[PDB]
Design a protein around this ligand. Structure first.
Ligand code: HEM
Ligand SMILES: CN(C)c1cccc2c(S(=O)(=O)NCCCCCCCCNC(=O)[C@]34C[C@H]5C[C@H](C[C@H](C5)C3)C4)cccc12
Ligand SMILES: [K+]
Length: 404
């Protein structure tokens, strides 16, 4: 526990630990939802992880994400030392500078790009599922979820298949840290892979995402090799652990709820709406901002340089946003959430993520309609900037399946 700064009133202190919440064994979302019990203020201070504010309700979370002038992305991670070394583009920049880097990134992951990849995503999901289907078991996280988005990235970025294991090792080193290296060391190792590929593609550009990025124009002039490197790093990692962990939460729920499975089996047209409801219920990202100046925010004095966690996860779990928030209903009329963020940094990959999810659910339920959590397995959750599932052992009877 970091000593309480003098400006923080005692009555706002709730020592929530975002990397190890108590009651984690009851499910991550549940463990974070304690921040929304009736005696917890809308805005609290925790002494864990260096000390930082947490906005606990959707209204404040949305408002802080809109107000980039007070709530800067310059240092977006807890703890402070990780936010400080983090330099990805555009996640470490504020508007107005961020605006055009965002425009460039959007050329590479936005809607028209997704509509063209739809089928390649489908062929990938199918071959992954078909290879598992006859075995009657998998670790979903390891055998389907992890191989999936890295392979879509390679397709986007025109990178060779043989690179996957190496790239996977580099990204895991950054995003699942075991404490053996600082974030800054993990970032440099990743940059060491990207640096030469950018050089090559600035000299000899093709039509992959890295060529488009490394040769784009920003705020009047050509992008620097440094800026391109910083963008490509985010393009790579931004779609990995979010998608892996999200698919894992989703499949865990479907494995545990035959009634919801059946609903989607009998009514496949509801899969896109079911995807949205799952995005809300199993929301999983929690980053934040640093105060650019002293600022009174909903009655609370915030001090220049204070960090604030603004959990994207919590908005849609908030009773004030969605009634009976822990309950899953695929026919919910107004599914509100900020699972992909809010304000100027609203996830550029959201459209690709939804096709990854929808395609996964469609293809899986079609080939393996009936599945369960392996007998005797207890599912372990992990908590962090991107919360997740440690392992997801699934079982099915292969006779209830069909090759398609
Ligand atoms: C379930 C899947 C996903 C979730 C939950 C998610 C979540 C988020 C969130 C919360 C942010 C805002 C971060 C902030 O404001 O600091 C963000 C931004 C971003 N995401 Fe995603 N994301 C997902 C998938 C993807 C994919 C597949 C890509 C493709 C590479 C991607 C690329 C990006 C990029 C480039 C940004 C930065 C936008 C900017 O700063 O202007 N994301 N995402
Ligand atoms: C102070 N002390 C002692 C400490 C205490 C506790 C833990 C510590 C840790 S730690 O081991 O817990 N590490 C926490 C930092 C994790 C960094 C992962 C970021 C990369 C994912 N990137 C994205 O860009 C994105 C950016 C954006 C949000 C999100 C999803 C997408 C979109 C991709 C993330 C390290 C060091 C010190 C620690
Ligand atoms: K920084």
């Amino acid at each position: 526990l970091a000593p309480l700064p003098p400006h923080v009133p005692e009555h706002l202190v709730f020592d929530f630990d975002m990397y190890n919440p108590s009651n984690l064994s009851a499910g991550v979302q549940e463990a974070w939802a304690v921040l929304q019990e009736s005696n917890v203020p809308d805005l609290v201070w925790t002494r864990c992880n260096g000390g930082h504010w947490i906005a606990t309700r959707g209204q404040l979370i949305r408002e802080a994400y809109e107000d980039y002038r007070h709530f800067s992305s310059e240092c977006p991670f807890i703890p402070r030392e990780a936010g400080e070394a983090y330099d990805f583009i555009p996640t470490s920049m504020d508007p107005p500078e961020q605006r055009q880097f965002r425009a460039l990134a959007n050329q590479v992951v936005g809607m028209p790009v997704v509509d063209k990849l739809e089928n390649r995503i489908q062929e990938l999901a199918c071959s992954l599922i078909e290879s598992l289907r006859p075995q009657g078991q998998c670790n979903f996280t390891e055998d389907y979820a992890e191989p999936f988005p890295i392979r879509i990235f390679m397709l986007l970025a025109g990178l060779p298949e043989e690179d996957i294991p190496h790239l996977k090792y580099l990204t895991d080193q950054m995003t699942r840290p075991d404490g053996s290296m600082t974030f800054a060391e993990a970032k440099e190792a990743l940059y060491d892979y990207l640096i030469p590929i950018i050089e090559q593609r600035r000299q000899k550009p093709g039509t992959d995402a890295i060529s488009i990025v490394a040769n784009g124009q920003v705020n009047g002039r050509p992008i620097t090799s440094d800026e391109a490197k910083r963008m490509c790093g985010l393009l790579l990692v931004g779609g990995l652990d979010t998608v892996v962990n999200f698919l894992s939460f989703s499949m865990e729920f479907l494995a545990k709820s035959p009634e919801h499975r059946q609903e989607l089996i009998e009514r496949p047209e509801r899969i896109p709406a079911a995807c949205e409801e799952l995005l809300r219920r199993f929301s999983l990202v929690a980053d934040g901002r640093i105060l650019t100046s002293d600022y009174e925010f909903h009655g609370v004095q915030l001090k220049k340089g204070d960090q604030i966690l603004l959990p994207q996860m919590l908005s849609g779990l908030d009773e004030r946003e969605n009634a009976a928030p822990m309950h899953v209903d695929f026919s919910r009329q107004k599914v509100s959430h900020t699972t992909f963020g809010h304000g100027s940094h609203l996830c550029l990959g959201q459209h690709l993520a939804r096709r990854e999810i929808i395609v996964t659910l469609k293809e899986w339920l079609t080939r393996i309609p009936d599945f369960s959590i392996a007998p005797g397995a207890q599912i372990q959750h992990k908590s962090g900037i991107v919360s997740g599932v440690q392992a997801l052992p699934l079982v099915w009877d292969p006779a209830t399946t069909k090759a398609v």
